[PDB]
Design a protein around this nucleic acid. Structure first.
Ligand SMILES: [Mg+2]
Ligand SMILES: [Mg+2]
Ligand SMILES: [Mg+2]
Ligand SMILES: [Mg+2]
Ligand SMILES: [Mg+2]
Ligand SMILES: [Mg+2]
Ligand SMILES: [Mg+2]
Ligand SMILES: [Mg+2]
Ligand SMILES: [Mg+2]
Ligand SMILES: [Mg+2]
Ligand SMILES: [Mg+2]
Lengths: 49, 49, 99, 25, 134
RNA sequence: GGAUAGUGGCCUACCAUGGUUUCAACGGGUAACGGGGAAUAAGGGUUCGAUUCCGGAGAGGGAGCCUGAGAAACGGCUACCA
RNA sequence: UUCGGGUCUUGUAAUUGGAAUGAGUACAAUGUAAAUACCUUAACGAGGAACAAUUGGAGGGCAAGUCUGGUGCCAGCAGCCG
């Protein structure tokens, strides 16, 4: 009837700042200057398309 | 008979003499199925005391 | 004088055939509606919309909408520009409901 | 000779629920 | 000592540290990389076009049942099949197979509703102020 | 020295080996024209700014020119690509 | 929450009278390069003042009506169809 305390394993899952480089390139480099204009234009173009 | 999904419209009067003023288009519909027989039935009630 | 179909040259490689549907016959309004690639819908501006105008549109809507162009006529009969412009507005917007 | 459009055609109000006169003003 | 520099001439590190840590946010990452619309049901659009494939609940004996108002629709953009809700069985009528339908976000798993059929609003047909062109 | 309205590796001849950089040079991305401004916020901040005003560039894409005080002009000209 | 409690001119699906007025139509003038419109104004323009305001939401009730299930008369669903 003895239940011992779980050992919280050290995170082997990639951290949020490490996942960015798991793909082919460094994703941080390829970003637009004005994200605000990004979302608005994409929404309008999607409806037109 | 005709292929399903063939739309159609119905009119009750085609002669000018009986035109009147009311709208002459009476019904609209879409043909759903073609068959050589149908089994339309109606409610018949017997009444006793 | 015009009677029956009239085929005319309209461009270097484009031709048109004009048909004047009998206004007094409904049976005509049906079968032209099933073959007309383009419709020039004549509307009396002074009088406004009529039955036969509306019915043909309903015939077209059920048997396949062709290209429909509204043509307003007898606008000179209006005596004031204000009512002329204002009348044009209702006729257009009502035409925008059907087409 | 000319068959003018009636009130139902012109306004095209269609099917609407009954609304009390007070809403107008 | 809060684990951070505080010197009057340490503005550079605070900025570089802040920029690096800002990428931790999922919201910041999605906004900059433009991947926020992957999660959207329509892929960033406000409405979805589709074809009506079948009316699943047409047979269902129970009127105005939740099944009766479901229609299978295939999105034109990608070709994935989904379901849409219709406002009521009367509105289920105006829809027939092979009609174009515009869809909008809304039985579980049905997240779409039909707002137009054949380029006209279903409510307009339901109030019967317009007629469906074929 | 040539050239230009004129300074200047702007170009030419001869010389030296220099110049920038962890205070991020160089390279890559940018749904990057910049600003006066607009929105939000209690304050710090965050976003937007093609768009009535200023400044820069362009006239389908390159290259080169006559005229004229002023143009590498295109509702001027010549060649090449589509 | 049942138990009940607090309060007074309230309701009518009833009749009925003459006063005001602009949306609109229109002599004219004003306006304008010339026009339209506005501001003005002779004359018409209201009782369903039909001179017919909309967009959403919530909740009823009904049948010799219809479907489903069952420790009888019920319940669920719903009912443009009797
Ligand atoms: Mg910007
Ligand atoms: Mg006016
Ligand atoms: Mg301490
Ligand atoms: Mg020199
Ligand atoms: Mg040299
Ligand atoms: Mg750009
Ligand atoms: Mg700007
Ligand atoms: Mg230029
Ligand atoms: Mg061009
Ligand atoms: Mg040029
Ligand atoms: Mg020019």
């Amino acid at each position: 009837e003895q239940s011992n305390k779980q050992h919280r394993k050290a995170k082997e899952k990639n951290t949020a700042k490490k996942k960015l480089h798991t793909q082919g390139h460094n994703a941080k480099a390829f970003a637009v200057a004005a994200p605000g204009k990004m979302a608005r234009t994409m929404q309008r173009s999607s409806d037109v398309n | 008979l005709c292929s399903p999904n063939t739309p159609f419209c119905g009119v009750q009067i085609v002669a000018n003499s009986d035109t009147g003023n009311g709208f002459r288009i009476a019904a609209t519909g879409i043909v759903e199925e073609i068959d050589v027989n149908i089994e339309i039935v109606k409610k018949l009630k017997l009444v006793g005391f | 004088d015009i009677q029956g179909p009239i085929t005319v040259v309209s461009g270097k490689h484009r031709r048109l055939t004009f048909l004047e549907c009998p206004a007094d016959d409904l049976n005509a309004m049906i079968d032209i509606a099933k073959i007309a690639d383009l419709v020039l819908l004549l509307i009396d501006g002074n009088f406004g919309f009529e039955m036969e105008t509306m019915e043909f549109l309903n015939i077209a809507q059920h048997h396949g909408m062709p290209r429909v162009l509204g043509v307003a006529t007898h606008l000179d009969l209006f005596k004031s520009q204000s009512t002329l412009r204002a009348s044009k507005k209702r006729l257009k917007h009502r035409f925008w409901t059907e087409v | 000779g000319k068959r003018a459009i009636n009130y139902q055609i012109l306004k095209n109000k269609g099917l609407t629920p009954k609304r009390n006169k007070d809403n107008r003003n | 000592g809060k684990g951070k520099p505080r010197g009057l001439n340490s503005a550079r590190k605070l900025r570089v540290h802040r920029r690096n840590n800002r990428w931790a946010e999922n919201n910041y990452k999605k906004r900059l990389l433009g991947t926020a619309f992957k999660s959207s049901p329509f892929g960033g659009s406000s409405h979805a076009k589709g074809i009506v494939l079948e009316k699943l609940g047409i047979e269902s004996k129970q009127p105005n049942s939740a099944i009766r108002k479901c229609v299978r629709v295939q999105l034109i953009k990608n070709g994935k099949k989904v379901t849409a809700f219709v406002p009521n069985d009367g509105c289920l009528n105006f829809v027939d197979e092979n009609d174009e339908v515009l869809l909008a976000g809304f039985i579980p798993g049905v997240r779409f509703k039909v707002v137009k059929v054949s380029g006209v609003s279903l409510l307009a047909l339901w109030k019967e102020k317009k007629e469906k062109p074929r």
